[PDB]
Each structure stands twice: as C-alpha cells, then as structure tokens.
Design a protein around this motif. Structure first.
Motif, mmCIF file in Angstrom:
data_model
loop_
_atom_site.group_PDB
_atom_site.id
_atom_site.type_symbol
_atom_site.label_atom_id
_atom_site.label_comp_id
_atom_site.label_asym_id
_atom_site.label_seq_id
_atom_site.Cartn_x
_atom_site.Cartn_y
_atom_site.Cartn_z
ATOM 1 N N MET B 21 -16.932 -30.696 -10.852
ATOM 2 C CA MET B 21 -16.144 -29.792 -11.753
ATOM 3 C C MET B 21 -14.466 -30.076 -11.555
ATOM 4 O O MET B 21 -13.742 -29.359 -12.407
ATOM 5 N N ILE B 25 -12.225 -29.160 -15.044
ATOM 6 C CA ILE B 25 -11.751 -27.856 -15.169
ATOM 7 C C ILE B 25 -10.437 -27.988 -15.910
ATOM 8 O O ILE B 25 -9.731 -27.349 -16.860
ATOM 9 N N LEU B 28 -10.597 -28.863 -19.479
ATOM 10 C CA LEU B 28 -11.000 -27.657 -19.904
ATOM 11 C C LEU B 28 -9.593 -26.884 -20.124
ATOM 12 O O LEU B 28 -9.275 -26.425 -21.428
ATOM 13 N N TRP B 34 -6.190 -23.666 -21.958
ATOM 14 C CA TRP B 34 -6.162 -22.309 -20.975
ATOM 15 C C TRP B 34 -4.892 -22.402 -20.511
ATOM 16 O O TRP B 34 -4.533 -20.892 -19.867
ATOM 17 N N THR B 65 0.850 -10.501 6.961
ATOM 18 C CA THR B 65 1.928 -10.193 5.962
ATOM 19 C C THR B 65 1.803 -9.860 4.709
ATOM 20 O O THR B 65 0.500 -9.843 4.139
ATOM 21 N N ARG B 66 2.785 -9.375 3.917
ATOM 22 C CA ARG B 66 2.642 -9.190 2.603
ATOM 23 C C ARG B 66 2.640 -10.710 1.780
ATOM 24 O O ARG B 66 2.184 -10.603 0.787
ATOM 25 N N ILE B 69 -0.792 -11.375 -0.129
ATOM 26 C CA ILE B 69 -0.814 -11.023 -1.312
ATOM 27 C C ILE B 69 -0.334 -11.944 -2.259
ATOM 28 O O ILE B 69 -0.801 -12.252 -3.387
ATOM 29 N N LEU B 72 -2.554 -14.488 -3.115
ATOM 30 C CA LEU B 72 -3.697 -13.951 -4.195
ATOM 31 C C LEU B 72 -2.922 -13.983 -5.549
ATOM 32 O O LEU B 72 -3.462 -14.712 -6.623
ATOM 33 N N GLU B 73 -1.768 -13.509 -5.710
ATOM 34 C CA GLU B 73 -1.165 -13.551 -6.978
ATOM 35 C C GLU B 73 -0.908 -14.981 -7.608
ATOM 36 O O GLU B 73 -1.094 -15.056 -8.844
ATOM 37 N N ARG B 75 -2.393 -17.882 -6.812
ATOM 38 C CA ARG B 75 -3.552 -18.419 -7.102
ATOM 39 C C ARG B 75 -4.207 -17.652 -8.659
ATOM 40 O O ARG B 75 -4.562 -18.402 -9.457
ATOM 41 N N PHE B 76 -4.008 -16.254 -8.516
ATOM 42 C CA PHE B 76 -4.762 -15.681 -9.812
ATOM 43 C C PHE B 76 -3.835 -16.045 -11.037
ATOM 44 O O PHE B 76 -4.394 -16.164 -11.943
ATOM 45 N N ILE B 127 5.627 -12.642 -12.516
ATOM 46 C CA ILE B 127 4.328 -12.041 -12.665
ATOM 47 C C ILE B 127 4.620 -10.666 -13.289
ATOM 48 O O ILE B 127 3.973 -10.291 -14.446
ATOM 49 N N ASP B 128 5.198 -9.755 -12.683
ATOM 50 C CA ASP B 128 5.796 -8.500 -13.379
ATOM 51 C C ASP B 128 6.388 -8.528 -14.845
ATOM 52 O O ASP B 128 5.922 -7.732 -15.355
#
Lengths: 195, 140, 201
Positions: B21, B25, B28, B34, B65-66, B69, B72-73, B75-76, B127-128
């Motif tokens: 995969m 991806i 794709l 995408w 730590t922060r 997060i 996460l952001e 990667r997301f 992001i924001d």
C-alpha cells in the motif's frame, strides 16, 4: 505593611551572627521600620520617604540601582558595621580593590528584646504555614489541569480515529465504483469497436 | 445521502489488493489530487521534531510536551513525521527548549539538501488559516 | 534527626508566648533534649527513654500510645478536641504539662529544667534554622506557580483545537461527496454516449 528578616554579621564582632528586621509600608521606597538584634538587646530605626529618597540625592545617583543595592545588601560584596553606644550603623559596597559608601543609619535602640524576637518568629512560622497551604492548593489545581489535559488528548485521538475510518471508507478502494463506471466505458467502447 | 449506509452494507470493504500500500497511496493522492486540500497541505514536507533530549536518540523522548499535539496536527495535515534526522529531512521544528539549536545548525552543514529550522507557530498559523504560511518568518 | 519547635504560653505568663523546641532522632520515645524561652531568657532540660517507659507504665498505658500523645502535645500534633496545658516555674526550673478533659487538668509529664547560660546563642541557632525553613517553602511555592501557569495554558489550547477538529471532521464528507458526484455524472455522460452508439451498432 510588609516586612523581611535576614541573617547578618558585623565586622565589629565578626564571630557572631546578627539578624536585621525590616518592616515597610507597601514599598521599601515609602520608608520602613528597621530592626537589628543580636538576640539579647533591641535596636531599631525609622527612615521614611523623604530621607530615603534624599539618600540617592546625597550620592547623586539613581534611586533605581541605589535601592537595588540596598535590597541586595539589606534584603539578603556588602559589609555591615554597627556601634551600640553611638547607635551608628553603616554599610558599604565593596568591589575589586575599590570601595564606595552605600548607606548609613543612626538608629535608636528599644527596651524590649523578648517581644521583638517573639513576634519575629511568630511571623516566620506563620509564613511557612501559609506557604505550605498555598503549595497544597496549587498542587491540586495543576494536577487537575493535567488530567483534563490528558483526557482531552484521548478524545482527540478517538476523534482522529473516526476521521481515519471515514477517510478510508470512501477512497482507497471505495472509488472502485468509479472504476466500475470505467469498466463499463471500456466494455462499451470495445464492443463498439467489435460491433 | 444514499452512499452512507450503502458503504456500511458492503461485504467486507477490504476487497482487493489491500496489503502492499505504500506506493499505492501516493499514486492515489497523485492521480486523484488528494493533495489539493487543507488537510494535506503538509503532504510534501519532511518534519523532524525536537522531542528528543539527544538528537537521533529515539528514547531521549521528552513526551508530555505540547510538541506531541503538533505531531498529530502535522500528520493529520499530511506531514510525514520522522523520528530520525537523516539526509531526507527538510524541516525541523523547535519547541521551547533551544538547547539543541546549535547542534542542528552544525549538523546542517553536513547535508547535501539542507533542512529548514522553524518555530512551532508556522504549522499552527498554517493550520488555523487552512493555508500554508511561509517558513521564513518562522525560521529559528 | 528531627527538630520541632512550638509556640506556647505558660499559665504563669498569659501574655508571654513561650517557645517549646524539641530535637530527637525520628523517635520521641528514644529520648530528647528540650529548650524553652521567652525572648529574654532560655532554659534546657533532658529526658531519656527509660524515663518515658516509667512515665507510660506509671500511667498503665502501652508505651507508644503515650508516645503518640506526646507527639500531639509537644510536637503540636494536638487536634481541635485536644487541650494540653503547660506549667513551668523559672525559679525552680521544673516543668510539667497536662491534659484538659472532664473540665479538669490531667498532667502528662514533668521535667527537671535548667536555665541556659547562653540564651542568645540557642536563639540565633533556632531562628537561623527557621529562616532557612521558610525560605525553602517560598521557593517551592514559586516553582509550583510556574507549572500551574504552564498547564492552564495547555488546557485551553487543546480544548479549542479539539473542538475545531470535531467541526472539520463533520465538514469533510459533503466536500468528498460533491467532489465525487461531479465526475460521476460526467462519466455517466460518457456512458450514455457510448451506450447509445453501441445500441445503434
């Protein structure tokens, strides 16, 4: 109405410790009640706004670093000397091979050593108790902060996982539906070529 | 509306060619764009994160730590987060602790392709506002 | 090594706070040295383990229970229902201390004392120690505040972001489905083209 206490010595008696008590009203700049003791006799002085500000007019320089050097000297290199009979107290900022006067008080003694001692430590043991109470409090507060923090992390991740599922549900081979229309295109086109 | 329960009624929607995969991806993403979406604006960025007390020591982790997060952001939002500062790295993000910024700059001199060093707010501002803010104001 | 100092009032001196200092090695039962003062003068005495054994057994209580009581009385372990009372004569250098229940005093123990020749020296020592003690708690409270700050920031940040993420997660699918259905109808256009052509031939 604020106050501070610090262990000190005097070169006049270098072998024993002394304890300087300062008590001021809302600021050191607003004057204060100073108190000195070896532990046996009472010694005190009062110097208020006008003369404490006249201090850093007598040596011509800024009250800023003047009061800073006082609070580095008085409120824990500085050298302190006091004479009991003349009740003259003075201290001086010592530098590398040079020295220049910083301040001097002509105090006036008081009658009553026991009580000043007694109140002093009254205050002190009060103060610790205060400290620890606040410590307990803040401890509780921030541990609460932390477990909300972590639980938010967890719900974050569950939301993210739902997000990932939704992603996969529609793309990676769900678009095989479009591929099916694609196969219908190929079948129809090839049957066209053959018929 | 109809594809909602229709997808869930699919017989085992793990149908065909479901294992190899990695290359299947990006194609794709590449074929069907995408990559033209805010949640993938970090798709073509390499990010090494300063969550290790020692660079490239995987268990000098400074977890809690922060910065976690931020991982996460990224990667997301499509960033590929790497745990090793190898020759394939393009960005390094610094948190509050600047104790290793000198090491990163010295290590940067060895690289054929040189990574950028950024502050945290680059991604958050990126992001924001749902749009890539540019790194030059976030450098160091 | 444990020290414990306690602000007290002798009955003989209601207006004078007297200060009871205790030093002992983790265990008041093993023996201790005691010092009393009132800011002008100080006194010191001593008690041994066997003295406590004799006191606890002339009680007819288990030693240790009487030790807990002593922890309450001399190391300020007394509770709100606990009313101890202290008596000392400076002339005789004899101390004793008691317990108030049933509207009556009930004496706990009693010590031979002696006036110290150097009150001011024990005083300096005690209060230097105390200064150190306060300062420690001060620093600790400072640090504690700092991390309280850090956590309160982090909590708000993550809460707002998690909400925003939930919002976007609910937003995504319609984007996706419009994106699909567009191309899909176009492919249906091609489908109908080729299918009419095939039916015609």
């Amino acid at each position: 109405m604020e106050r501070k206490i610090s262990r000190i010595h005097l070169v006049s008696e270098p072998s024993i410790t002394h304890f300087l008590q300062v008590s001021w009203e809302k600021t050191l700049e607003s004057g204060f009640v100073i108190t000195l003791t070896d532990g046996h006799s009472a010694w005190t002085g009062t110097v208020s706004e006008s003369e404490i500000s006249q201090e850093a007019d007598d040596m011509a320089m800024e009250k800023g670093k003047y009061v800073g050097e006082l609070r580095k000297a008085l409120l824990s290199v500085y050298t302190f000397n006091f004479s009991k009979e003349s009740c003259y107290f003075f201290f001086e900022k010592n530098l590398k091979d040079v020295s220049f006067r910083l301040g001097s008080f002509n105090l006036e003694k008081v009658e009553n050593p026991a009580e000043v001692i007694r109140e002093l430590i009254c205050y002190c043991l009060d103060t610790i108790a205060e400290n620890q109470a606040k410590n307990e409090h803040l401890q509780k507060e921030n541990e609460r902060l932390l477990r909300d923090w972590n639980d938010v992390q967890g719900r974050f991740e569950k939301c993210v996982s739902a997000k990932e599922a939704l992603e996969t549900d529609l793309y990676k081979r769900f678009i095989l539906v479009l591929n099916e229309k694609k196969t219908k295109i190929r079948s129809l086109h090839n049957k066209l070529l053959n018929a | 509306n109809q594809l909602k329960e229709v997808f869930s009624g699919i017989k085992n929607s793990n149908e065909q060619t479901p294992e190899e995969m990695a290359s299947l991806i990006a194609d794709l993403e590449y074929r069907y764009s995408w990559d033209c979406s805010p949640l993938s604006m970090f798709r073509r960025h390499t990010v090494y994160l300063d969550s290790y007390a020692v660079i490239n020591d995987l268990s000098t982790k400074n977890e809690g730590t922060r910065l976690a997060i931020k991982a996460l952001e990224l990667r997301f939002h499509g960033a590929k987060v790497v745990s090793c500062l190898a020759e394939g790295v393009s960005h390094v993000i610094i948190g509050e602790d600047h104790s290793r910024v000198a090491d990163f700059k010295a290590f940067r001199r060895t690289f054929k392709r040189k990574f950028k060093i950024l502050k945290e707010s680059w991604v958050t501002d990126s992001i924001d506002k749902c749009e890539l803010q540019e790194e030059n104001q976030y450098l160091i």
